[PDB]
Design a protein around this ligand. Structure first.
Ligand SMILES: C=CC[C@@H]1/C=C(\C)C[C@H](C)C[C@H](OC)[C@H]2O[C@@](O)(C(=O)C(=O)N3CCCC[C@H]3C(=O)O[C@H](/C(C)=C/[C@@H]3CC[C@@H](O)[C@H](OC)C3)[C@H](C)[C@@H](O)CC1=O)[C@H](C)C[C@@H]2OC
Ligand SMILES: [Cl-]
Ligand SMILES: [Cl-]
Ligand SMILES: [Cl-]
Ligand SMILES: [Cl-]
Ligand SMILES: [Cl-]
Ligand SMILES: [Cl-]
Ligand SMILES: [Cl-]
Ligand SMILES: [Cl-]
Ligand SMILES: [Cl-]
Ligand SMILES: [Cl-]
Ligand SMILES: [Cl-]
Ligand SMILES: [Cl-]
Ligand SMILES: [Cl-]
Ligand SMILES: [Cl-]
Length: 111
């Protein structure tokens, strides 16, 4: 297992697409999964866009680090250690304690 977060480029969007920088409100399409078994716990595909302010710590740390630097249309895979996810708490009744997480993410907009 990695010492920290792994971020993989799955595909590149627009070369001059707006860039996700700290302080921006960014809009992301995602699928979240438990890394240990691949079970999917959430997606917003076909639902409303998920917006968050990058860098303020409202999302798990793996997202604040992992989404940073994306340009619109980029797709990334995030592999997130427990300390950069929900740690001993878990979440949603869906993520057990001490879970490694995987997310597929696509940047849709930057505001
Ligand atoms: C305070 C206002 C309530 C507000 C609640 C809602 C809008 C309800 C709505 C269903 C929330 C999420 O859906 C958008 C839902 O998302 C999941 O399904 C999911 O896929 C996930 O993991 N996501 C969502 C996408 C961004 C990454 C991550 C996250 O970081 O989510 C964030 C998260 C839970 C962070 C905690 C916050 C507390 C810290 O202590 C902890 O610190 C480690 C990290 C979300 C976006 C928060 O910022 C927003 C809120 O909490 C969880 C499996 C379960 C979670 O429902 C609970
Ligand atoms: Cl890569
Ligand atoms: Cl590409
Ligand atoms: Cl694109
Ligand atoms: Cl753009
Ligand atoms: Cl969609
Ligand atoms: Cl910020
Ligand atoms: Cl802040
Ligand atoms: Cl750049
Ligand atoms: Cl960890
Ligand atoms: Cl932890
Ligand atoms: Cl929570
Ligand atoms: Cl499980
Ligand atoms: Cl795990
Ligand atoms: Cl997928």
């Amino acid at each position: 297992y990695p010492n920290g977060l792994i971020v993989e480029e799955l595909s590149m969007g627009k070369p001059n697409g707006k860039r996700a920088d700290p302080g921006k409100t960014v809009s992301v399409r995602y699928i979240g999964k438990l890394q240990k078994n691949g079970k999917i716990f959430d997606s917003n595909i076909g639902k409303s866009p998920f917006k968050f302010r990058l860098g303020i710590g409202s999302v798990i740390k793996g997202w604040d680090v992992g989404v940073n630097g994306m340009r619109v249309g980029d797709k990334r895979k995030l592999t997130i250690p427990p300390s950069m996810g929900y740690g001993v708490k878990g979440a949603g009744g869906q993520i057990p304690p001490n879970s490694w997480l995987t997310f597929d993410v696509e940047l849709i907009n930057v505001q």
